[PDB]
Amino acid sequence: HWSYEGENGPENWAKLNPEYFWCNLKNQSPVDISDNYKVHAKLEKLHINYNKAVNPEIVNNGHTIQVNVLEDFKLNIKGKEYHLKQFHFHAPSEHTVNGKYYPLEMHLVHKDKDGNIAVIGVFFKEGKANPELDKVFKNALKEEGSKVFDGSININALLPPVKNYYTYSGSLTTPPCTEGVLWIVLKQPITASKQQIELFKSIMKHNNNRPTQPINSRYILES
Amino acid sequence: HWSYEGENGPENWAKLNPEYFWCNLKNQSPVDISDNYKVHAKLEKLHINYNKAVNPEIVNNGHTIQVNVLEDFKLNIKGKEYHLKQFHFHAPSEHTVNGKYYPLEMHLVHKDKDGNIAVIGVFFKEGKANPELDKVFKNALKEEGSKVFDGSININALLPPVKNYYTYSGSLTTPPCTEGVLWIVLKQPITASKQQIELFKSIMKHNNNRPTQPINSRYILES
Ligand SMILES: CC(=O)Nc1nnc(S(N)(=O)=O)s1
Ligand SMILES: CC(=O)Nc1nnc(S(N)(=O)=O)s1
Ligand SMILES: [Zn+2]
Ligand SMILES: [Zn+2]
């Protein structure tokens, strides 16, 4: 089984299972979003409205706290119609901006009818507490397992008002590290209280962010 | 052995050898350079001066006619210092522009000190004959083999005056189809005479262009 340290750490994920060959390729995530290879461009506007997920499932799978939604929220971008499947968290953040780590990163995982994946990343900096985050972190089991949250979560409240973003072609950040992933990282971080961030970290017991990967021949676009 | 048709055709390259696993991944070349996923941006200017290659080696390797240069022509771009190694040809072209094929495409293959690859592609449309092309095609062996050209080739004469270009992250277009390749396709095609184009095609005996591949989560930048 893979982990974020030791023999089964990120550096040896590709050795754990034949299906993890992707982890050693040339278009991996996360990456350092650097001005060195970031270019500004007129990009498609992000149109999403994740109203609210009613009675979503909160899962502790040992590697993160994930929320599986029952609704069918659509993300239409780059000629595809992706459907939100779940969002989860990483602490510290996986992506960095000019070398800077944020204390928390949320990933909204979408998939289209053909299995294509798009992930929207949201950075969280310490500050005013976020209402929705308590619903997730305080109702997450401390041990591996799932639980149905008796209530609803306003996902829009887990997103910044302005949705300018960075985008690049990458991969899943945990085995099998499949590539061909469409990454959309919102430029504006929102806030989470120190207690919310520490609660998540204390549940995980360890950092669950994959080291940044070489950008190689890719450029990152910024809207 | 792989080919451009039959059992060993492009569709089954990945089955020929374990090392060809790349041919089935998510960041393959060539691609259709489509306005649907092409974005304009301020890109690094292309600074290259491939003066002339003296006594280069002309090789017919059965899949193309390739010219190996002895000089050390540098291509400095995207934070790397690539060195020109050789240029070769494909007929019809490999890349297309909004679905349009050109009769001929030239590839200038560069590699840096770490093995990183950058390929500059040049489209040729039928028209005024190109002086340099005769040096290559008329001196290429009709059967597999190499030969040293007794003369010099002005590579700059194989490039358009204006060097605006498209760029994207891709792969080699023949096995092993390694990814992480930096592609730079010059937007302006130059000309080759119908006879020059047919001479190359008659030597090859068959089309030697790989089918275009899915762009997947990549965008193509245009300077
Ligand atoms: C089952 C599933 O979604 N797996 C993922 N692996 N990595 C992901 S991430 N961090 O790139 O969003 S999602
Ligand atoms: C040895 C070598 O250079 N191999 C190549 N395979 N494909 C290439 S291409 N068409 O992408 O320039 S170069
Ligand atoms: Zn994630
Ligand atoms: Zn080629």
- Domains, chain B, with CATH or none: 1-223 (3.10.200.10)
**Contact between residue B164 and residue B221 where contact means Cβ atoms under 8 Å apart:** no
Residue B94 annotated as binding site = yes
Selection from B108, B92, B96 nearest residue B182 by Cα: B108
Angle at A78 between CA A75 and CA A79, to 5 degrees: 90
- From the CA of B171, the nearest ligand is 2
Spatial distance between the Cα atoms of A67 and A198, rounded to a whole number of angstroms: 19
Q: Counting atoms of ligand 1 from 1, which one is nearest the CA of A85?
A: 3
User: How many angstroms away from the CA of B12 is the closest CA of chain A?
Assistant: 20
The amino acid at A133: L
Pairing of strands B65-68, B179-186: unpaired
Ligand 1 center from residue A109 Cα (angstroms) = 7
Locate A133 and state its tokens.
Answer: 């985050």
- Indicate the burial class of A21 (C-beta count within 10 angstroms; 0-12, 13-18, 19 or more): middle
**Contact between residue B109 and residue B84 where contact means Cβ atoms under 8 Å apart:** yes
Q: Which residues of A touch B217 (CB under 8 A)?
A: 78, 116, 118, 169-170, 180-183
- DSSP 3-state of A126: strand
**Contact between residue A182 and residue A103 where contact means Cβ atoms under 8 Å apart:** no
Q: Which residue has the tokens 């450029």?
A: A219
**Contact between residue A158 and residue A122 where contact means Cβ atoms under 8 Å apart:** yes
Ligand 2 center from residue A29 Cα (angstroms) = 26
- Residues 6 or more apart whose Cβ sits within 8 Å of residue B7: none
Q: Which residues of B touch A79 (CB under 8 A)?
A: 36-37
Q: Which residue has the tokens 């960095």?
A: A96
Q: Does the beta-carbon distance from B116 to A217 stay under 8 Å? A: yes
Spatial distance between the Cα atoms of A26 and A166, rounded to a whole number of angstroms: 19
Q: Which residue of A has its CA nearest to B216?
A: A180
Longest pairwise C-alpha distance within chain B: 46
Selection from A95, A218, A131, A196 nearest residue B170 by Cα: A218
Judge whether A63 counts as a catalytic residue.
Answer: yes
Spatial distance between the Cα atoms of A52 and A153, rounded to a whole number of angstroms: 5
- DSSP 3-state of A22: helix
Spatial distance between the Cα atoms of B83 and B113, rounded to a whole number of angstroms: 8
| Mutational pocket test of ligand 1: of A111, A122, A174, the residue with most ligand atoms within 8 Å of the beta carbon | A174
Spatial distance between the Cα atoms of B13 and A155, rounded to a whole number of angstroms: 45
- Cα-to-chain-centroid distance, residue B52: 18
Q: Counting atoms of ligand 1 from 1, which one is nearest the CA of A172?
A: 11
Q: Which residue of B has its CA nearest to A216?
A: B180
The amino acid at A51: N
**Contact between residue B97 and residue B125 where contact means Cβ atoms under 8 Å apart:** no
How many of the other CB atoms lie within 10 Å of CB of A151? 12
How was this entry determined? X-ray
| Mutational pocket test of ligand 1: of A172, A178, A179, A204, the residue with most ligand atoms within 8 Å of the beta carbon | A172
Spatial distance between the Cα atoms of A92 and A206, rounded to a whole number of angstroms: 10
Catalytic residue from among B1, B40, B47, B63: B63
